[PDB]
């Protein structure tokens, strides 16, 4: 139920897109290890800390990109083995009837 309600909220957010229009400043930190070490890269360091602020959205701005573009259905997931029985033998008489 906790997993479902989140997806519900993300769907329902379209139904009222702008009622008390949104707020965004949880500016957060992330520690990152370049996996490139051999140092001439940070300056001599092994990690780097990055402060992420989310870009502030314009209230008065329409959707940006074309979404109506339409493409055919991709391949389905790999076929399952069919697991039937040996198969009943069929007669000429019943095949004709």
């Amino acid at each position: 139920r906790v997993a479902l309600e989140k997806s519900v909220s993300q769907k329902v957010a379209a139904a009222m897109p702008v009622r008390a229009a949104d707020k965004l400043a949880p500016a957060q930190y992330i520690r990152y290890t370049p996996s490139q070490q051999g140092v001439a890269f940070n300056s001599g360091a092994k990690q780097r800390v990055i402060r992420m602020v989310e870009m502030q959205k314009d209230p008065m701005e329409p959707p940006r990109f074309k979404i109506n573009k339409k493409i055919p259905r991709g391949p389905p997931s790999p076929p399952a083995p069919v697991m039937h029985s040996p198969s009943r033998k069929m007669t000429v008489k019943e095949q004709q009837e």
């Binding site: 992330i30 990152y32 370049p34 490139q36 001439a40 890269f41 940070n42 300056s43 360091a45 990690q47 780097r48 800390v49 990055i50 402060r51 992420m52 602020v53 989310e54 870009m55 959205k57 940006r64 990109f65 573009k69 493409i71 055919p72 991709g74 391949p75």
Partner: protein, 290 residues
């Protein structure tokens, strides 16, 4: 589908020379320069006199081809994709025509989002077998001339009214009568007719390399720069890898060691492994034919 993944996939010559970065995250900011689907654009400034670089391609289009999202160079080596596929195979064959491209992108996006989220989904097994010529021209230290503000086009008309305050460079642009000037995004990304990669391959082809055994069945190796500080007991300990080793003549006066193997295939394999690579006891051992 949208892309929407946190914290981009970046190299170290674009992420900056400062270990303290402030970047902004825009949720569906631009469209991808390849995929043409919208993705999460991250904008940071590397250093002080830099350009505010941003990611150009999707997380997905970098997971396909193991590249950085803004320089479009290999995360491990720092080279164009045509050079790395030259030093590998080319079995991806990403479509370039329209409907095929969006169809392939949809299916590979389902493939990646039906997996872990850590490996270069097709490039992994071929990325095991590496260390071709690309390692001998891999860039050692970052080229921070990439992160650099463009030529002031008002200064080209001699009319830059900002003068000393303009954050764009007042220096010469490159002569357009140059192969190293055209450089489309998709040409750099698919590995097709990239002139930077052409010049890197022309340099790596004229890199010094093995010669064949000119006369038949001769396995004789002519070792110059042998050195008088090393021992022949370590030579066999390095050399029993290849096969049935025959006699090893040693001349420590000209610093030349003569080597014979069973088959000429083993001598060619030793030529492959040894030439211009092998440094034992911290001292370069040169091997030649004749």
């Amino acid at each position: 589908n949208w892309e929407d993944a946190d914290f981009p996939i970046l190299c170290q010559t674009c992420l900056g020379e400062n270990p303290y970065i402030r970047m902004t995250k825009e949720k569906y900011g631009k469209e991808c320069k390849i995929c043409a689907r919208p993705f999460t654009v991250f904008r940071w400034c590397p250093g002080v006199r830099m350009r505010f670089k941003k990611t150009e391609v999707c997380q997905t289009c970098s997971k396909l081809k193991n590249v950085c999202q803004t320089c479009l160079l290999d995360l491990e080596y720092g080279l164009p994709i045509q050079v790395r596929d030259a030093g590998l195979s080319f079995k991806d064959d990403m479509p370039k025509s329209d409907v095929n491209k969006e169809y392939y992108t949809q299916n590979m996006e389902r493939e990646i989002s039906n997996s872990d989220g850590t490996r270069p989904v097709g490039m992994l097994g071929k990325a095991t077998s590496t260390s071709d010529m690309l390692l001998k021209l891999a860039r050692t230290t970052p080229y921070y001339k990439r992160n650099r503000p463009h030529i002031c086009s008002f200064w080209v008309k001699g009319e830059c009214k900002r003068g000393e305050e303009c954050p764009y460079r007042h220096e010469k642009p490159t002569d357009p009568d140059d192969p190293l000037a055209d450089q489309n995004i998709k040409d750099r990304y698919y590995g097709i007719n990239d002139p930077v990669a052409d010049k890197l391959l022309k340099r790596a082809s004229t890199m010094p390399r093995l010669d064949p055994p000119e006369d038949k069945t001769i396995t004789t190796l002519y070792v110059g720069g042998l050195g008088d500080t090393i021992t022949e007991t370590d030579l066999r300990n390095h050399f029993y890898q290849f096969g049935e080793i025959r006699t090893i003549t040693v001349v420590q006066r000209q610093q030349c060691a003569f080597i014979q193997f069973a088959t000429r295939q083993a001598a060619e394999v030793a030529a492959e492994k040894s030439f211009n690579k092998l440094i034992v006891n911290g001292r370069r051992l040169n091997v030649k034919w004749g």
